[PDB]
Amino acid sequence: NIVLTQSPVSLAVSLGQRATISCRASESVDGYGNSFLHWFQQKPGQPPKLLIYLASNLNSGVPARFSGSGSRTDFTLTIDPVEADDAATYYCQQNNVDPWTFGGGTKLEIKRADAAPTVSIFPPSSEQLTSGGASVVCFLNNFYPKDINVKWKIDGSENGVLNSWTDQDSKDSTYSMSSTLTLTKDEYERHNSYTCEATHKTSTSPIVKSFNR
């Protein structure tokens, strides 16, 4: 009304290879011998960077691995060859028909070789113990692919955990994950050994980090 519809919803491209992302418009975005359809890249935490303007012109400062074709209701952004900085969502924008809209985005994921996670465990700070609480934290860092699992074991035995995942890294295409077990200073003080176990496609068996209070 207009509606822009991108395709596919998500794709996974190997470093070096070709990404192509479609944007169909509801009705023509043409005016004065020009397609008023523009491309954008957005990464988590930052705003969209203008990629391609008026369908085919590359914006100042933007690489040339990035190409924009198409004409009326039919547009294509091509990324060739894909490098690691390109993991991101891509939006098409139209600003010539009432009302202005963006497409629903396409999520470009880079493909790379399987990689095992660096795991690290951290006791609670004394600052936190000064007050009533004790948090223990594991970082599971720089692994591929995203899928992964964590287990917490206290004095051997398997509530209080909170999990967060990064988006694909923009230099090495990894994902990382953080995990943090939370307790009371008294309940933590009642036990000695503390352990998180990371399991992932990359190895048949779990990577294991631990310490004793």
């Binding site: 930052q46 705003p47 303007y53 985005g105 953080s178 310490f211």
Partner: protein, 212 residues
């Protein structure tokens, strides 16, 4: 040239939401000056503009809720959004359209606003120190509201080896952590500090990662 959004990062249901964009070094009588929103779900929405003549254009659905005004002097333009609801939570951007591109080419960094009747709580920051050639340190940022929080290492000088994880809500409060990985001979041979900021509660915290 340069855009900066600013305003309350926390506004209550039914109140007016109000933001300011600041333009440094080219006149807001030179272009089209826009507000765009991004929802937690990630969809983008165009909001409107004031053109350089003081001529405005509104997203039809926002027509009666939205104002865009300017101050010719300050080189800054304003967004007013009435009768705010939980679905107005978004990170808001101001941005520019030049005759050069006819596209949205200059983007402010954005500013998160959360519409919620919960109450600002500042974070607690805790150093994360070990209990190899590479060493991994962290900062735990626990128990705050609303988003956002920024985190840096040694004022941004350290940046390559850093993971800052997205916050996670639980029982009305957020927690977040950040990891950094250095040569295990640039620490503790050299100080490493995390710099947490939570503008909403005006908190600014440096924490030195101390061994043992």
């Amino acid at each position: 040239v340069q855009l900066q959004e600013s305003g309350p990062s926390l506004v209550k249901p039914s109140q007016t939401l109000s933001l300011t964009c600041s333009v440094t070094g080219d006149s807001i009588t030179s272009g089209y000056w826009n507000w765009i929103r991004k929802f937690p779900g990630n969809k983008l929405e165009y909001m409107g503009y004031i053109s350089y003549s003081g001529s405005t254009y509104y997203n039809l659905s926002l027509r009666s809720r939205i104002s865009i005004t300017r101050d010719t002097s300050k080189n800054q333009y304003y967004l007013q959004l009435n009768s705010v609801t939980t679905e107005d939570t978004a990170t808001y951007y101001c941005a520019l359209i030049t005759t050069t591109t006819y596209a949205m080419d200059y983007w402010g960094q954005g500013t998160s606003v959360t519409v919620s009747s919960a109450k600002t709580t500042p974070p607690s920051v805790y150093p994360l120190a070990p209990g190899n050639s590479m060493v991994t340190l962290g900062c735990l940022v626990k128990g705050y509201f609303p988003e956002p929080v920024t985190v840096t290492w040694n004022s941004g000088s350290l940046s390559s080896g850093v993971h800052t994880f997205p916050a996670v809500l639980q029982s009305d409060l957020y927690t977040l952590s950040s990891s950094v990985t250095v040569p295990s001979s640039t620490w503790p041979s050299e100080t490493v500090t995390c710099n947490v900021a939570h503008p909403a509660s005006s908190t600014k915290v440096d924490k030195k990662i101390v061994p043992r």
